Each structure stands twice: as C-alpha cells, then as structure tokens.
C-alpha cells in the first residue's frame, strides 16, 4: 500500500577497491553555481518537508550502494543511483525531484533537499560528513545503468568558486549514473556524482557533490 513511480534497489556496498582502474585527470577551473543548481564557467556556451501518521511502512533503508528504478513507456530504466548510510538515502536532487520512494516493504518520503546545491535526502537528515581531503585520490562507486557495478579511481582536479574550492572529477557516465557516490581510501562517501560542467574541449567535469 506503499506505492511510486520510482523505487530503489541495493546493488553494492560501499567500498574503496584495491584492483580498481586508474583514470580521469586533475583540471583546476573557475565556476559560478547559479541558484537554478547550474555551475556556469566564465563565459558559458533549500526546504525542509513536514512529512505525522503515514498509511505505509516507513522503507528498507539497509547500508549500501542503490540504483534508483522508474518506468516509462518503454518500460523501466534507472533514473539515478544513490547511497543509504546512518539510515538516511542520499542521491542528487535532479535524479528523483522529490518524488516518493519504494524501498521493500514500506517507502522513503524525502526529508530535506536543495535544488541550488542538487542534494536530496530521505528519512532523516544529510548523514554525509566526510569530505575530500584536497589531495588524495578518490573512488568513485560507479553505479552505471545496465552495467555491472564497478570502482574507478581518479586525482579529483577543482572547481574555483566565489564560494570557495569544490573537488572535481572528470569522469563522463550515463545520466542515471547520478548519485553514485564517491569515496574516499576509508571507505567514507565524501560526496556524490553527477552535477558538473562541460569544459570547452568538451569533457564533462562532476563536482564531488557534498554538504557545505
Ligand atoms: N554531458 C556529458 N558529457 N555527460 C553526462 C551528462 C549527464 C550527467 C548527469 N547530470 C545531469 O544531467 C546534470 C543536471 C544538472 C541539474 C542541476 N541541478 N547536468 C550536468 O551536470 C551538466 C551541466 C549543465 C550545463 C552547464 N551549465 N549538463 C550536461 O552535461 C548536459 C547534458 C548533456 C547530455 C545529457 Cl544526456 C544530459 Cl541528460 C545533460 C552526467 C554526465
Ligand atoms: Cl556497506
Ligand atoms: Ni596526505
């Protein structure tokens, strides 16, 4: 009795994998995030819910590394990926825009969100403290549709904001790849992918998408 256009579903734990590929590269650019939730380079070409006594169970919740399911016409697809740590779901805003969740027997309902900074959670408050550290080398969980589950790692490059500094990953997946999180050599999600910038030379650069 608990029931949405889109559910999750566990595909992996959240891990920093020794055999994993090397790749990617390390930019340093200057960007603008507009309050849309777009960074923007120099020269281009959020709420809290009330969520009282619901008719459903609450959802699964379970530690780990999630696809984020939805059909269309066609039938299903994945819409985004996430990551389920300290009993909260985290993904990109973009991936789910709000929208309910099934997770197993019950549903998640969204807890907090941001559209500038694309960030949702589900259940309870943003669990993700840990951040990149400036200068070690990060894996990113990519939770690729159609595709096996597997590890990269990379030398995050920077975004260079009025803000402040952001690491940033140049690696180019799927849209519903979104929300994969990104770990560091603890095994520790320091922020997720998927919101980024197309460079001039046309590769795609995500933010390590975290709180504050
Ligand atoms: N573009 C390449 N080469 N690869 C993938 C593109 C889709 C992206 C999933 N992210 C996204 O769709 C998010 C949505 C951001 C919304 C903010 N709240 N877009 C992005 O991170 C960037 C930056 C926006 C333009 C610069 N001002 N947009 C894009 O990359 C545009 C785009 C290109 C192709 C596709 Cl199929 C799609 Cl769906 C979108 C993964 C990387
Ligand atoms: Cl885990
Ligand atoms: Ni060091």
Sequence with gaps: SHMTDMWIERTADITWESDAEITGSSERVDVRLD??????????????????????????????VYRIMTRG????????????????????????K???????????????????EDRLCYGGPWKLQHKWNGHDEVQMIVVEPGKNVKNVQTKPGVFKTPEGEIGAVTLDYPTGTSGSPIVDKNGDVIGLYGNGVIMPNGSYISAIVQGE
């Design 98 to 116: 709000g929208a309910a969740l099934m997770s197993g027997e019950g549903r998640l309902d969204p807890y907090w969100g941001s559209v500038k």
């Design 35 to 64: 309050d849309d939730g777009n960074f923007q380079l120099m020269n281009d070409p959020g709420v809290l819910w009330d969520t009282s006594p619901k008719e459903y169970k609450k959802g699964d919740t379970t530690t780990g």
């Design 73 to 96: 016409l066609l039938g299903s697809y994945q819409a985004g990926a996430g990551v389920m740590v300290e009993g909260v779901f985290h993904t990109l805003w973009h991936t789910t």
